[PDB]
Design an enzyme around this catalytic site. Structure first.
Site, PDB file in Angstrom:
ATOM      1  N   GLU A 141       0.830  -1.206   0.000  1.00  0.00           N
ATOM      2  CA  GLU A 141       0.000   0.000   0.000  1.00  0.00           C
ATOM      3  C   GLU A 141       0.865   1.257   0.000  1.00  0.00           C
ATOM      4  O   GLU A 141       0.522   2.269  -0.638  1.00  0.00           O
ATOM      5  CB  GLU A 141      -0.972  -0.003   1.176  1.00  0.00           C
ATOM      6  CG  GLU A 141      -1.851   1.255   1.260  1.00  0.00           C
ATOM      7  CD  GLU A 141      -2.319   1.554   2.696  1.00  0.00           C
ATOM      8  OE1 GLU A 141      -1.462   1.617   3.608  1.00  0.00           O
ATOM      9  OE2 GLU A 141      -3.545   1.702   2.916  1.00  0.00           O
TER      10      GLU A 141
ATOM     11  N   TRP B 179      -8.553  -2.278   1.136  1.00  0.00           N
ATOM     12  CA  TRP B 179      -9.401  -1.206   0.629  1.00  0.00           C
ATOM     13  C   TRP B 179     -10.737  -1.679   0.064  1.00  0.00           C
ATOM     14  O   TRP B 179     -11.642  -0.853  -0.095  1.00  0.00           O
ATOM     15  CB  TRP B 179      -8.666  -0.431  -0.467  1.00  0.00           C
ATOM     16  CG  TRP B 179      -7.771   0.651   0.036  1.00  0.00           C
ATOM     17  CD1 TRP B 179      -6.451   0.542   0.364  1.00  0.00           C
ATOM     18  CD2 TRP B 179      -8.130   2.019   0.253  1.00  0.00           C
ATOM     19  NE1 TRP B 179      -5.966   1.764   0.782  1.00  0.00           N
ATOM     20  CE2 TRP B 179      -6.978   2.687   0.721  1.00  0.00           C
ATOM     21  CE3 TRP B 179      -9.319   2.743   0.110  1.00  0.00           C
ATOM     22  CZ2 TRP B 179      -6.977   4.049   1.043  1.00  0.00           C
ATOM     23  CZ3 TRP B 179      -9.315   4.105   0.424  1.00  0.00           C
ATOM     24  CH2 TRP B 179      -8.149   4.737   0.884  1.00  0.00           C
TER      25      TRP B 179
ATOM     26  N   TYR C 257      -5.243   9.380  -0.874  1.00  0.00           N
ATOM     27  CA  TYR C 257      -3.937   9.564  -0.246  1.00  0.00           C
ATOM     28  C   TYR C 257      -2.772   9.839  -1.187  1.00  0.00           C
ATOM     29  O   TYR C 257      -2.168  10.922  -1.144  1.00  0.00           O
ATOM     30  CB  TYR C 257      -3.560   8.314   0.554  1.00  0.00           C
ATOM     31  CG  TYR C 257      -4.296   8.098   1.854  1.00  0.00           C
ATOM     32  CD1 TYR C 257      -4.006   8.867   2.984  1.00  0.00           C
ATOM     33  CD2 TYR C 257      -5.252   7.087   1.971  1.00  0.00           C
ATOM     34  CE1 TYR C 257      -4.673   8.643   4.196  1.00  0.00           C
ATOM     35  CE2 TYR C 257      -5.917   6.854   3.169  1.00  0.00           C
ATOM     36  CZ  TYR C 257      -5.627   7.630   4.276  1.00  0.00           C
ATOM     37  OH  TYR C 257      -6.304   7.399   5.451  1.00  0.00           O
TER      38      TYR C 257
ATOM     39  N   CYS D  67      -7.066   9.420   6.823  1.00  0.00           N
ATOM     40  CA  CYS D  67      -6.961   9.156   8.247  1.00  0.00           C
ATOM     41  C   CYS D  67      -5.608   9.588   8.800  1.00  0.00           C
ATOM     42  O   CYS D  67      -5.538  10.428   9.705  1.00  0.00           O
ATOM     43  CB  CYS D  67      -7.204   7.664   8.493  1.00  0.00           C
ATOM     44  SG  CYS D  67      -7.966   7.375  10.050  1.00  0.00           S
TER      45      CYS D  67
ATOM     46  N   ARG E 256      -5.916  11.635  12.536  1.00  0.00           N
ATOM     47  CA  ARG E 256      -7.112  12.220  13.144  1.00  0.00           C
ATOM     48  C   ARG E 256      -7.941  11.189  13.898  1.00  0.00           C
ATOM     49  O   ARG E 256      -8.682  11.547  14.818  1.00  0.00           O
ATOM     50  CB  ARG E 256      -7.984  12.877  12.072  1.00  0.00           C
ATOM     51  CG  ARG E 256      -8.619  11.881  11.119  1.00  0.00           C
ATOM     52  CD  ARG E 256      -9.667  12.514  10.184  1.00  0.00           C
ATOM     53  NE  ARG E 256     -10.114  11.567   9.164  1.00  0.00           N
ATOM     54  CZ  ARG E 256     -11.014  10.611   9.366  1.00  0.00           C
ATOM     55  NH1 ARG E 256     -11.657  10.495  10.519  1.00  0.00           N
ATOM     56  NH2 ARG E 256     -11.269   9.743   8.391  1.00  0.00           N
TER      57      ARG E 256
ATOM     58  N   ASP F 202      -8.067   3.569  15.270  1.00  0.00           N
ATOM     59  CA  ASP F 202      -8.466   2.312  15.900  1.00  0.00           C
ATOM     60  C   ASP F 202      -7.194   1.627  16.387  1.00  0.00           C
ATOM     61  O   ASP F 202      -6.435   1.057  15.594  1.00  0.00           O
ATOM     62  CB  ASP F 202      -9.245   1.432  14.930  1.00  0.00           C
ATOM     63  CG  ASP F 202      -9.572   0.045  15.506  1.00  0.00           C
ATOM     64  OD1 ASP F 202      -9.344  -0.218  16.711  1.00  0.00           O
ATOM     65  OD2 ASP F 202     -10.060  -0.802  14.734  1.00  0.00           O
TER      66      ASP F 202
HETATM   67  O1  LIG Z   1      -5.145   4.180   8.416  1.00  0.00           O
HETATM   68  C1  LIG Z   1      -6.141   4.028   9.111  1.00  0.00           C
HETATM   69  C2  LIG Z   1      -7.407   4.117   8.545  1.00  0.00           C
HETATM   70  C3  LIG Z   1      -8.528   3.947   9.352  1.00  0.00           C
HETATM   71  N1  LIG Z   1      -8.391   3.697  10.698  1.00  0.00           N
HETATM   72  C4  LIG Z   1      -9.633   3.497  11.491  1.00  0.00           C
HETATM   73  C5  LIG Z   1      -9.939   4.559  12.550  1.00  0.00           C
HETATM   74  C6  LIG Z   1     -11.461   4.575  12.573  1.00  0.00           C
HETATM   75  O2  LIG Z   1     -11.940   3.574  13.461  1.00  0.00           O
HETATM   76  C7  LIG Z   1     -11.832   4.229  11.139  1.00  0.00           C
HETATM   77  C8  LIG Z   1     -11.976   5.484  10.279  1.00  0.00           C
HETATM   78  O3  LIG Z   1     -13.295   5.990  10.319  1.00  0.00           O
HETATM   79  P1  LIG Z   1     -13.597   7.543  10.662  1.00  0.00           P
HETATM   80  O4  LIG Z   1     -12.544   8.121  11.573  1.00  0.00           O
HETATM   81  O5  LIG Z   1     -13.609   8.318   9.364  1.00  0.00           O
HETATM   82  O6  LIG Z   1     -14.955   7.641  11.314  1.00  0.00           O
HETATM   83  O7  LIG Z   1     -10.757   3.467  10.617  1.00  0.00           O
HETATM   84  C9  LIG Z   1      -7.116   3.596  11.264  1.00  0.00           C
HETATM   85  O8  LIG Z   1      -6.945   3.368  12.472  1.00  0.00           O
HETATM   86  N2  LIG Z   1      -6.001   3.764  10.461  1.00  0.00           N
END
Ligand SMILES: O=c1ccn([C@H]2C[C@H](O)[C@@H](COP(=O)(O)O)O2)c(=O)[nH]1
Ligand SMILES: NC(=O)C1=CN([C@@H]2O[C@H](COP(=O)(O)OP(=O)(O)OC[C@H]3O[C@@H](n4cnc5c(N)ncnc54)[C@H](OP(=O)(O)O)[C@@H]3O)[C@@H](O)[C@H]2O)C=CC1
Ligand SMILES: NC(=O)C1=CN([C@@H]2O[C@H](COP(=O)(O)OP(=O)(O)OC[C@H]3O[C@@H](n4cnc5c(N)ncnc54)[C@H](OP(=O)(O)O)[C@@H]3O)[C@@H](O)[C@H]2O)C=CC1
Ligand SMILES: CCCCCCc1nc(N)nc(N)c1-c1ccccc1
Ligand SMILES: CCCCCCc1nc(N)nc(N)c1-c1ccccc1
Ligand SMILES: O=c1ccn([C@H]2C[C@H](O)[C@@H](COP(=O)(O)O)O2)c(=O)[nH]1
Lengths: 560, 560
Positions: A335, A357, A383, A443, A464, A467
């Site tokens: 990626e 994805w 991205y 993200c 921002r 998870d």
């Molecule tokens: O690179 C990434 C992409 C996504 N997420 C997770 C965080 C959130 O749980 C979800 C993104 O959804 P929103 O923040 O847009 O609601 O995916 C990550 O941790 N890392």
């Protein structure tokens, strides 16, 4: 016994310690120093008339050492053997002044009895330093209160192994005791040595110390200290601190009054020294479950979140691919290469077995975004498109965008190559004018680079929404890898990856699985080597076959 | 004396403690709890046959208390008076076996002798709790080892004042007559109380404890503990720890040898408990000077930098306007209002007396940015333009850009009002396609918002480049004020401002001035109130007259 006994050893994850009466790996400079400092340091000087430590070894380990290093200087050397004679050892080479005469004993009990009786006033600590014969004897006797283990993360051909022992799950995965075929083979370790082998006298070794990862000659490794246990087991003046305590007590009330309420989550609480950098990650999970706030989110699942969190990972000895759960390295690599190409066609990923994805570029998901004009797989101007073509007009994933928009990645590399103290070396994927055209709002959205006064490169990335359970270990690997690639093409040395986090959360339905993960001790980090360095001049030159992950030994899948 | 004596008091920065035999301020809830907890604290409980503390007070303080608090429950009350009769007090309430008879004594030494004599087995600690007459006697006697002082940040009208005392510069700035009227008017404090007013026996009171700022009923305040000192000082389980010690000894060696070859800088090191949030800032300055790396920046003048630093400031009780050096509040507020308008004409600021942008919008400076076509004062498509018109093409600072670009500020406010758990509530000034059209590339370039389960708003701001000496306090105030404004027009409560920092530095030629500032003890933070709240429905409705700073008492100018 009144003197403490310890074992010092370096082993591979399969417990290999030697081959052909030598060590199995290239020289490990830091482990050599550690061995010397631990076995030479008097207990008084570590806390910070001649008293010295003793090292006890088998005959083959003694013979395995270059005659230059033997006896180990400034320690009392005891060799356990039936054939070697003390007078021959003395006649091997001149005895330097103030050194102890080397003794030869017929067993480990005899060696220890000699130390207790004849060296009562002079020996502080006793170290069993090998080989397998003497390690087995000392474990079966139960006399070792602590094991100093250098965990070598790579496997090598070996023909001598450290014995299986209670606690050796610290080295590699064990197929449980509910999935094990039979009780795992192991020396019995008596907790009370005088009671020998009895059902109620079974000991095990638990880690109290796990260092950060080191490396030498392309071998990653770290240092752990295990302690023998039963199997069933801020400062100021005494006036100042006492005056202050009633005020701290009321100010600290709320922390206490909601802390002991639930039983707090904590990652491997028996580990006192938490040097491994993955403890940042484990402690973050515990911190969110203990102290985060629960709210419903867009999907209605239920999240527990904190706001504003940080971690930092060193890049100069090893690479932060997390070990308490396996990280999908192939996805990270493919990626990132895709991002660097400016590619927005997720089918190019899917067709490589990288499906991360695909759930977000289905015809259904795209229609839900009011993007019915998107082909399946088209992530929009996301991205890698903003990285290489910031602000360019987007048509579809097949369009050639060469020369359109701002190439932030090229600007970053050119700035690092010519004026590395510049304070504007940033790359952003957050384009508010484009968000409605993307499959997913970015993200990991900003990264900044920094060079110190010693050609060492650091990177910060701002995320921002994180998870911690699923995405964060992947994001750490991606930007750490980006930092290695940028550093190589800019003639810099990679130093540190710093992770800044906005909404940091775990899903409530993952909590039980995370609690199981937090019982796992982290393993040493692998090394990521860049291959074919002489061929790779620019960031676009890297390919998937230009990387190798060395010594990666993660824990297995989750019991749930 | 075998029993410790402490003074407990709340005072304004002018040492005011009372008016009309009452307190000068509205009720301070947290201070009331503090007083209860501190004066009822067994020495047992705090650090973690009935025993109790004593509170000693003057007749007027006794009469000042409401009947429901008279006597103070679970403490032995002693009133110093020549006219009050013990028997009259005992006839006012039932004399219960569970409480102590109130005692009356003719002087403080008599009160203290009574305590040591008749209450030898039952009294733990003695607190002098007012008023001015008793505080002056206790200070002049020298018996108080510690002062528990609640620093009320607002001046209130008072007719009773705490005596001037050595150490009272903890309260406010000292005019040029610092050493002049002090020996005449300040109480002499004996260090050894039995040696009285001997020149060798002079004490002073030094802070060991400074808390974060609290507030109630519109009054900001904090808690300090001062300890008596001589004037002439001024101008786990042992086995686990011992096993680990040798490993830590060698791991720390390199860092140990750097620390002892450096004179380490430390802000007000006599303060042991450092609860005040401004210690983050002072500690950061010290850490940069101790551990940053020196390099020549754009201008080649000398900079010392770290990379990747954080601070967090609470916004629920007070406002983080730093106190060890005055912050240009008027500049902070006018520039933020200018940002919110989308205004790019720095002349609007300059004609208001805010000159901070003037040097970066001159004909010479714009010409150096290869912006010869820019009119003097035009900052280009920078901060507030990107906030309100992200992505719009710029022509000049006179153009009406209504409806052009993305209005990020509006989107954030609407999302907070309708879906506050959303994780995309961001605002960015970093537009890589516009950077070359700006006078200055943005410094504070991203901010994200967050709402918890309690309608409490927090904000992160990411700043790529931070002059900690001159820019950071201003930046802290700007985004904390922005969070107050956003929270108000979204019916939220402001909770926390989080500062994420990239290249974090001090200029080498500011170091001596910075060391001077690091000798200053922070004061309690002020309160920032929003006036005319019911008139203010939208972010554009705020004017400069809608804010008041309450209780701001910063240190004066720096000599170096
Ligand atoms: O690179 C990434 C992409 C996504 N997420 C997770 C965080 C959130 O749980 C979800 C993104 O959804 P929103 O923040 O847009 O609601 O995916 C990550 O941790 N890392
Ligand atoms: N990676 C590491 O940390 C270490 C690696 N090594 C490696 O291990 C290998 C050598 O270990 P190993 O091969 O097991 O040989 P050892 O060093 O264990 O020596 C074995 C000999 O010591 C004596 N001995 C050992 N155990 C006993 C006992 N219980 N009672 C009485 N005498 C005893 C006997 O001597 P005799 O036959 O003379 O009676 C035996 O033949 C080499 O490859 C070496 O490099 C060694 C130390 C540490
Ligand atoms: N902000 C705070 O922390 C506090 C504020 N206050 C405020 O302070 C004011 C009251 O304090 P104040 O007005 O100074 O009066 P006091 O409470 O000090 O009482 C004064 C009386 O106590 C006796 N007394 C005091 N000092 C001595 C002494 N050295 N030797 C002998 N007797 C002594 C005399 O009683 P007699 O005339 O009967 O002999 C004197 O008239 C009130 O406004 C109260 O609200 C009070 C306590 C704490
Ligand atoms: C001769 C000194 C080599 C020291 C480095 C190898 C080593 N590391 C650890 N952690 N434990 C050990 N017991 C040994 C060891 C000590 C003696 C002989 C062979 C290996
Ligand atoms: C009835 C008790 C009120 C407690 C709050 C006021 C207070 N705060 C501080 N820090 N010190 C004090 N000595 C007092 C005080 C105690 C008794 C009378 C007046 C003020
Ligand atoms: O809001 C601001 C704006 C500027 N600076 C300082 C940081 C840098 O020292 C300088 C800007 O220079 P560059 O980082 O752009 O080179 O101004 C701040 O601290 N805060």
């Amino acid at each position: 016994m009144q003197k403490p006994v310890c074992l010092v050893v370096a082993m591979t994850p399969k417990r290999g310690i030697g081959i052909n009466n030598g060590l199995p790996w290239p020289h490990l400079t830091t482990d050599f120093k550690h061995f010397s400092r631990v076995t030479k340091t008097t207990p008084e000087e570590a806390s910070r008339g001649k008293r010295f430590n003793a090292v006890v070894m088998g005959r083959k380990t003694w013979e395995s050492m270059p005659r230059k290093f033997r006896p180990l200087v400034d320690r009392l050397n005891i060799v356990v053997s039936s054939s070697l004679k003390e007078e021959d050892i003395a006649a091997e080479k001149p005895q330097a002044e103030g050194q102890q005469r080397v003794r030869v004993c017929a067993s480990l009990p005899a060696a220890l009895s000699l130390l207790e009786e004849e060296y009562k006033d002079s020996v502080d600590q006793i170290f069993v330093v090998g080989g397998a014969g003497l390690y087995e004897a000392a474990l079966s006797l139960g006399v070792a209160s602590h094991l100093y283990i250098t965990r070598v993360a790579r496997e090598f051909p070996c023909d001598v192994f450290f014995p299986a022992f209670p606690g050796d799950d610290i080295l590699s995965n064990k197929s449980t005791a509910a999935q094990a075929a039979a009780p795992a083979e192991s020396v019995f370790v008596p907790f009370c040595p005088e009671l020998g082998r009895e059902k109620d006298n079974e000991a095990t070794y638990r880690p109290i110390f796990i260092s950060k990862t080191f490396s030498d000659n392309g071998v990653p490794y770290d240092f752990v200290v295990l302690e023998k246990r039963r199997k069933t087991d801020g400062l100021q003046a005494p006036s100042s601190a006492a005056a202050i305590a009633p005020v701290l007590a009321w100010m600290d009330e709320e922390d206490r009054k909601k802390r002991e309420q639930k039983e707090l989550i904590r990652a491997v609480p028996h580990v006192h020294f938490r040097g491994h950098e993955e403890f940042q990650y484990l402690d973050l999970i515990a911190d969110i479950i203990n102290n985060g706030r629960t709210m419903d989110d867009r999907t209605g699942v239920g999240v527990i979140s904190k706001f504003g969190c940080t971690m930092r990972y060193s890049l100069d000895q090893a690479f932060p691919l997390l070990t308490t759960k396996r990280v999908f390295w192939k996805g990270v690599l493919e990626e990132l290469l895709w991002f660097i190409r400016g590619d927005t066609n997720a089918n190019h990923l899917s067709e490589k077995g990288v499906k991360i994805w695909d759930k977000n570029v289905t015809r259904e998901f795209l229609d839900s975004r009011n993007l019915p004009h998107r082909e399946v797989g088209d992530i929009g101007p996301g991205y890698g498109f903003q990285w290489r073509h910031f602000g360019a007009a987007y048509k579809d994933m097949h369009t050639d965008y060469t020369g359109q928009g701002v190439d932030q990645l090229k600007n970053v590399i050119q700035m690092l190559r010519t004026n590395p103290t510049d304070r504007r070396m940033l790359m952003t994927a957050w384009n508010p004018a484009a968000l409605d055209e993307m499959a997913l709002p970015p993200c990991h959205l900003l990264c900044q680079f920094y060079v110190n006064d010693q050609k060492e490169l650091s990177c910060i990335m701002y995320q921002r929404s994180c998870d911690v359970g699923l995405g964060v270990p992947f994001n750490i690997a991606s930007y750490s890898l980006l930092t290695l690639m940028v550093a190589h093409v800019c003639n810099l040395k990679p130093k540190e990856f710093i992770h800044f986090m906005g909404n940091t959360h775990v899903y409530t339905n993952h909590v039980e699985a995370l609690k199981e993960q937090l019982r796992r001790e982290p393993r040493p980090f692998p090394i990521v080597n860049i291959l074919n360095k002489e061929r790779i001049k620019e960031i676009d030159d890297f390919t998937a076959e230009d990387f190798e992950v060395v010594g990666y030994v993660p824990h297995g899948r989750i019991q749930m």
